[PDB]
Design a protein around this ligand. Structure first.
Ligand SMILES: [Ca+2]
Ligand SMILES: [Ca+2]
Lengths: 197, 197
């Protein structure tokens, strides 16, 4: 049984992964099971943070490690909030607060372009010295709505309008969102590689 | 016309690029046309270094920038020389010196497994603050020979045995190498993306 450490403490991320690779002989183990502490994300790109976290987990555990970083990028805001997606409305802020700051920022930029994208970058390291980690990059293109809509999901989901569905991410059923999202796409890229291996 | 800064002083890499995207309305400008000072690669992965270089070029020039990092990974040496491929026997060591160093490292490891692979990671940054650069990753699988052979190529080519061709990279005609190498693959990925864009 191939053992891979998951850097994330996020339970939904682990569950999504187990579901994804259910037919493969691979076992994901949260880094917390090795008492690995979180490491600070200091990169300016998702890929840099994904690597930082995977390399850390691999270093401490001695096993292969997989990490991801994700965020919302808005064209009119020069790709902000980007890697500051979680920090966009200050520390200790809520999802609702962050949504409002994004809406205000666009309002202030008064730029007709509401284009935006969700990104998920997964990095898989064989060990901490791996110079060529597997990189999977999922991209989900949409638009920022004028006001929050939808009961599902989390974070910026309520203002992420999905043109193909004429609904926001928060309006989609969970399964449908997870099938077409930036995470879904990254995960399918990962599965293709792992399955082939 | 779209202008992209190439963060490389290598004339062959520029020529290969122009040749590759000859049908596209893109002009590649070497960073030397902007007097960009070279920056130090501090990453432990090719992708990290490509991003460093691309980010630097974009910041200094104000234009989108493309960069690459490349190396040889040898399984018996835990993926070494890896990101130190261009530093393996000293910053000023000749290609011949590095080859000998690799051969010596291998015979010291006493591992019947001579599996190795060339890597080329390309990163394209819209600007210095781009959190989601395009990453193209070309991989070329082969093995390390026991002695150098072949009149073509450069660097580690004389000891990169290519099972599919029963020759080293240096023995291949230049056009054949370029069609199958880690760089050729990375460039084809870039071209697909840029063309469809
Ligand atoms: Ca993050
Ligand atoms: Ca280099």
């Amino acid at each position: 049984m191939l053992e891979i450490v998951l850097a994330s403490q996020n339970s939904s991320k682990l569950a999504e992964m187990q579901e994804l690779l259910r037919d493969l002989e691979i076992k994901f183990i949260p880094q917390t099971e090795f008492s690995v502490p979180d490491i600070e994300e200091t990169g300016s790109t998702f890929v840099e943070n994904a690597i930082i976290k995977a390399r850390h987990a691999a270093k401490q555990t001695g096993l292969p490690a997989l990490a991801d970083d994700s965020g919302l990028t808005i064209a009119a805001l020069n790709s902000a909030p980007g890697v500051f997606s979680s920090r966009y409305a200050g520390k200790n802020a809520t999802d609702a607060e962050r949504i409002q700051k994004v809406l205000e920022a666009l309002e202030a930029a008064d730029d007709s372009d509401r284009s935006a994208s969700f990104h998920c970058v997964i990095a898989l390291m064989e060990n901490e010295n791996d110079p060529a980690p597997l990189i999977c990059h999922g991209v989900w293109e949409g638009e920022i709505a004028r006001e929050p809509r939808g009961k599902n999901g989390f974070g910026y989901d309520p203002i992420f309008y999905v043109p193909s569905h004429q609904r926001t991410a928060a309006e989609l059923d969970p399964q449908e969102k997870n099938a077409i999202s930036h995470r879904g796409q990254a995960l399918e890229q990962l599965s293709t590689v792992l399955t082939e291996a």
